[PDB]
Design a protein around this ligand. Sequence first.
Ligand SMILES: CC(C)CCC[C@@H](C)[C@H]1CC[C@H]2[C@@H]3CC=C4C[C@@H](O)CC[C@]4(C)[C@H]3CC[C@]12C
Ligand SMILES: CC(C)CCC[C@@H](C)[C@H]1CC[C@H]2[C@@H]3CC=C4C[C@@H](O)CC[C@]4(C)[C@H]3CC[C@]12C
Ligand SMILES: CCCCCCCCCCCCCCCC
Ligand SMILES: CCCCCCCCCCCCCCCC
Ligand SMILES: CCCCCCCCCCCCCCCC
Ligand SMILES: CCCCCCCCCCCCCCCC
Ligand SMILES: CCCCCCCCCCCCCCCC
Ligand SMILES: CCCCCCCCCCCCCCCC
Ligand SMILES: CCCCCCCCCCCCCCCC
Ligand SMILES: CCCCCCCCCCCCCCCC
Ligand SMILES: [Cl-]
Length: 543
Amino acid sequence: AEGKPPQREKWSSKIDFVLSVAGGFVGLGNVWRFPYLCYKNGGGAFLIPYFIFLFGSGLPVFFLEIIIGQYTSEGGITCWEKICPLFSGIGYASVVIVSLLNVYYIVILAWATYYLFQSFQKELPWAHCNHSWNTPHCMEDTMRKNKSTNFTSPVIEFWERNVLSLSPGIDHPGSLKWDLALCLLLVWLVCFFCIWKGVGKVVYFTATFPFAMLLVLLVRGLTLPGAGAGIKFYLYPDITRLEDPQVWIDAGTQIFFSYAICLGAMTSLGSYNKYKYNSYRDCMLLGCLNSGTSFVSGFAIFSILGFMAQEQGVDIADVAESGPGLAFIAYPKAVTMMPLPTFWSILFFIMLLLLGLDSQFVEVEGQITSLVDLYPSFLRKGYRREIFIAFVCSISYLLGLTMVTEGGMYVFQLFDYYAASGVCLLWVAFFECFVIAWIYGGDNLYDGIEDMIGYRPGPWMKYSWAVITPVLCVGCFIFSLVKYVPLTYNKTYVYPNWAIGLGWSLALSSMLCVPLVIVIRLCQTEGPFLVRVKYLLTPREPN
Ligand SMILES: CC(C)CCC[C@@H](C)[C@H]1CC[C@H]2[C@@H]3CC=C4C[C@@H](O)CC[C@]4(C)[C@H]3CC[C@]12C
Ligand SMILES: CC(C)CCC[C@@H](C)[C@H]1CC[C@H]2[C@@H]3CC=C4C[C@@H](O)CC[C@]4(C)[C@H]3CC[C@]12C
Ligand SMILES: CCCCCCCCCCCCCCCC
Ligand SMILES: CCCCCCCCCCCCCCCC
Ligand SMILES: CCCCCCCCCCCCCCCC
Ligand SMILES: CCCCCCCCCCCCCCCC
Ligand SMILES: CCCCCCCCCCCCCCCC
Ligand SMILES: CCCCCCCCCCCCCCCC
Ligand SMILES: CCCCCCCCCCCCCCCC
Ligand SMILES: CCCCCCCCCCCCCCCC
Ligand SMILES: [Cl-]
């Protein structure tokens, strides 16, 4: 009838938790989004707000999500019923955010698959510019300085004329690309078959190959000439850029995105932990590993960029796209200089695919588990769950088909900025921290943490939950709103008004779930307003 006793099968060993978390929040957000966002925001001044957010609101919120999941023993959509039923809309907002993120998180893997397929031939296409797709301006980067128009390198010509085939603006959708659609279908089929059945010895190889490949890339990048200028550009900050809301709104949002918080996945992962498991040290070490990985990789990219700038003769700020395609212009160029380029290119794209696939598996499984926990009778047992998973995957693929046309890069950039990024994360993080600090009780949460982990933590977590996170969120929100700046692609193309309206609607769709739930709960209860709000603030609504 109720079938509750099965509950949630706890992890077999803490190793399963460590590996699942590491594969969850260490993915493409460390090796693809961090370098290009750092490059876009001047470079060097991006680190101060980055570390300020990381040490004030990045790790405490992740630990709060994990500890809430371990405490309530419930997913990311039902745990708020046992904490604050009035503010139960946070779970729905997180579900919407992760659903919108999973749609566009796969196009990067589709591009990686296309590159890997194209790299299986004798000579790499992005090494010479005598191919058909090349324009009359392409000039080998070796001869660029010797000669002197606006010549374009073969690597960029390839990226913007074979994989992308860009169109003049979002007004023109061109025609659907079929090879990219096939790659998208292949990736989605692999993901569905992995989630459907299955999650010993290959798990020790999946979690070690990317780090070795990254170390090899770092060694090659540091060995290259001209790396000193790139490192200096990467590290030395520009204090005159901090007076712009873009730097802060990018650094804080990137910190929130890279830790996979405000998504309902960390809570679901922590829900499987034991009630007497010391998760504090493990969470701190995993956060340290994530931050260390994202920072070291940047040295490899910025040294390659400095070498490219020195070789071509142009400045370090005009050597690549400065957009969502920096990782497809920097690393493929460095692969060419290595001996036996094809082998290294294959290995690099394989590790990129693995890094993306692990995170995609984790997030999709978390979302499906939350939606199943919502309804544990109809969407459960046998054939009624696989059909639901297939329906979700098919709908996601059909929606993501919009980003593989001749003008899908603009839609991808709009999705990246507005959906699952920007102010929709700040809103949810602020509401979570404010509720936990000022309604349930930081002291009560600390008592529970001391009961379950064994020793009472320090005041850093309480202070960050109480004063440091909401202040930063509100300040960043107001600063961004007051000094409005429109979004542009490659700092040259300006979007139409309706595109900005669509992006703001995408953000508001996730943002507008808390007041709706508040109103519905208020009108679903009988009695005076004050009596209703007081009863809907009591933590133990069920049991
Ligand atoms: C909600 C789920 C089903 C997806 C929503 C349907 C939309 C977004 C999907 C379904 C069919 C897809 C279309 C199929 C064919 C074309 C032709 C091309 O000239 C423009 C892209 C376009 C138009 C695709 C874009 C995305 C598309 C319109
Ligand atoms: C009594 C409570 C549990 C009922 C919950 C249902 C209401 C509160 C929730 C459930 C999920 C929420 C929806 C999540 C997704 C969407 C799609 C978006 O395009 C419009 C908002 C909308 C429609 C949200 C509105 C409010 C919503 C429907
Ligand atoms: C704006 C500051 C960002 C970095 C600092 C975050 C919080 C630091 C800890 C707060 C508590 C101070 C005492 C901690 C050591 C005893
Ligand atoms: C981007 C819009 C759709 C994204 C997914 C939304 C589904 C989750 C919220 C609604 C599911 C529960 C509805 C019934 C609740 C009693
Ligand atoms: C815009 C992104 C959409 C991604 C796919 C939709 C995900 C959620 C749809 C199914 C919700 C089912 C709720 C429970 C129904 C019994
Ligand atoms: C008006 C000239 C033609 C424009 C063609 C539409 C381009 C793509 C717009 C749709 C992108 C978002 C899809 C829906 C997301 C919920
Ligand atoms: C790039 C460095 C990021 C480091 C983030 C974590 C620093 C906090 C110290 C963690 C040390 C190990 C755990 C000790 C017990 C709390
Ligand atoms: C089982 C304990 C937790 C597992 C993770 C431990 C990570 C320890 C810190 C390692 C930081 C290395 C950064 C290297 C970046 C390339
Ligand atoms: C003792 C008070 C601690 C902070 C209480 C919550 C602060 C919520 C935001 C208030 C405004 C912060 C600065 C915004 C500047 C635009
Ligand atoms: C922005 C988050 C907090 C918003 C709080 C107010 C939400 C709307 C409340 C209006 C209640 C109307 C129904 C009253 C029934 C007696
Ligand atoms: Cl990061």
